[PDB]
Amino acid sequence: GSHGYVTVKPRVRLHFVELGSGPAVCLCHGFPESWYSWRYQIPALAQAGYRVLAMDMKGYGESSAPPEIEEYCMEVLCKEMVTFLDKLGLSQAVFIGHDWGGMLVWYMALFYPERVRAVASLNTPFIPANPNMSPLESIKANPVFDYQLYFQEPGVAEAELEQNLSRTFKSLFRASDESVLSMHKVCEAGGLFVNSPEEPSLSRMVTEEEIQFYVQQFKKSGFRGPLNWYRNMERNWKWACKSLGRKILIPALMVTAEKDFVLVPQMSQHMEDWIPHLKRGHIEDCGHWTQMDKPTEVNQILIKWLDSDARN
Amino acid sequence: GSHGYVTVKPRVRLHFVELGSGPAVCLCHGFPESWYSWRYQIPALAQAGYRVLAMDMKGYGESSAPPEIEEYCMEVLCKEMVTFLDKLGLSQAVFIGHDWGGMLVWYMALFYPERVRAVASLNTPFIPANPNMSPLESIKANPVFDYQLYFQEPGVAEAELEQNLSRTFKSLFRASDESVLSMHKVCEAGGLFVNSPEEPSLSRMVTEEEIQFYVQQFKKSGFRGPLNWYRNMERNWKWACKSLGRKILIPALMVTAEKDFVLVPQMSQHMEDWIPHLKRGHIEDCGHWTQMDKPTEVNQILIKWLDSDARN
Ligand SMILES: CNc1nc(C)nc(N2CCC(C(=O)NCc3ccccc3C(F)(F)F)CC2)n1
Ligand SMILES: CNc1nc(C)nc(N2CCC(C(=O)NCc3ccccc3C(F)(F)F)CC2)n1
């Protein structure tokens, strides 16, 4: 891979790993991850005939990580990704996201369809903003997203996640059957790791060397930037409401994971109302950490879609 | 543009500026220049439908600049450029060079045709190595390349070129009719700038801001790395002789400049013997600094060739 750096603002520089030739495919990771979360996809997509740009998203890795909350609202993040394309001299790119990156790519497709050739999300569904319900009332109706309330107070989740980096990543990056964390009980317990092992075992999904890569990446900036993605609920809601009723008409793929107990497949059930020609993939025995849980399946699904529906 | 960095060896990292989408086109500058020497070509080639990778060559700018002479022999430089393609996941690229970069791209085409889609040189002709004549005897037969003897002794040309950076670049980067330097008299005079103005005027080719960009680039590493390109005559000759008699059969373009009084058009007259299907461009009223002297003409020639002969 090549390490690429794009200055989108005087103080904001975005880093990416680049491999391959062909149509541009921009990969956008989730929380709390890395370009490295795409390690299995990058060579496979390149081999398939694509130019891969695997991002360190704003706040992560070698990308800029300002402390200000407003720097991580979806409107700003998407605008920067447009400038990213501008600086690279790209008219369009395919955008593939997972988790928080999945949310970003949906809004890229929604607000900047002229710059998005095609869009794919792993796990993260597209649910249009509800102008009659505040972001807090949407959690008040969904006990599943309550852990995000714990992420609200600045400094709190930062301290817990940064206390022991190895423990953090070993505790998070696990297959569903290996889970040591209860996401539906976080805010009541006052932490992610209060009731989980002090020295967690290594998941079948990852090697020690892979965990240590994440550790080193988060030694650089910590979790403030990453957590700030959660702290713009009102701003993101207000921006999203400006696009009420509009449909996504560019080629689109939604990939669900059977064993993601937070981003459940059922959450995606109404997407066709807003994305008429949506295509779908579904991975059995797959938890939240899709790319590393089922890399072979992810590669198969993405390549099939890129070579067919995504082309015009 | 995007700033890209490719690690080709533990201690050698190559920098490039990247713009556009389409077939990969690698631009290789001369001495003593910069990726910035391609400033007029980068947007034009990108607009034409090409993915441009404008190098800082080894020894220059943001690329690694080790002090060792052997690090800059053509064999090593070319091998690194192959590894460069490998790291980027590129099977092939078009290679376009000027000056020392022109020499490099010819040897890329000669020794690695499977990795070079097409090859173009500005000013620098392809003359097969003569196994019956030492590199020194080739200068003894050509009073035009005598200035290169001044570049041989380590430290000497470094000191002169680094003494006053603004003076250096203002003295060098001039149209032929603005010349303040006598290249055929350098080694006898004991320097490039001994008889040239202390405070040279600004050439019509460049602005003050453009000169200052070069100044800042060479503040970083100086001229040792760049000058080391000249200090491998024997090594380069021995390597080149291994390819005696072999022809370049990939698409090829030679662009000559009427007023380059060192790399004269006539030097290229026999190239068809070794490159049967060579295509040609010729720029009138054009000195050594081709890209900045006649940017419109260079763009026209390169795009015409890239869109026709270079394709298969
Ligand atoms: C606008 N609200 C909204 N709505 C939906 C349907 N999704 C999302 N997002 C953003 C937040 C994101 C998230 O919290 N990731 C982290 C995480 C997901 C799962 C399991 C453990 C974890 C954790 F926290 F442990 F890393 C999940 C996708 N946001
Ligand atoms: C193997 N020998 C060989 N043979 C040929 C035909 N060309 C070359 N090269 C490499 C050296 C390169 C060079 O000296 N550039 C600098 C320069 C060129 C012009 C006018 C001023 C200057 C200078 F020195 F002022 F920058 C010219 C092309 N080498």
Side-chain angles (χ1 to χ4, degrees), chain A residues 204-219 222-229:
Chain A
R204 67 170 182 267
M205 296 197 315
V206 287
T207 66
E208 185 68 31
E209 288 71 41
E210 288 172 316
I211 288 295
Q212 287 311 310
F213 189 90
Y214 288 92
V215 170
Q216 286 308 293
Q217 292 299 299
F218 282 79
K219 213 182 187 284
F223 289 80
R224 184 173 184 169
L227 284 158
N228 281 347
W229 283 62

Side-chain angles (χ1 to χ4, degrees), chain B residues 175-177 204 257-259 283-287 293-294:
Chain B
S176 290
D177 54 291
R204 67 170 182 267
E258 186 191 24
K259 303 302 191 83
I283 315 175
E284 297 281 294
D285 186 52
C286 187
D293 202 341
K294 296 285 174 167

Side-chain angles (χ1 to χ4, degrees), chain B residues 31-32 99-100 103 125 145 147-148 151 172 183 230 262-263 288-289:
Chain B
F31 172 98
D99 191 74
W100 259 124
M103 191 63 68
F145 285 139
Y147 69 92
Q148 296 188 23
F151 292 166
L172 292 172
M183 296 307 288
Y230 292 94
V262 169
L263 302 173
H288 176 71
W289 315 101

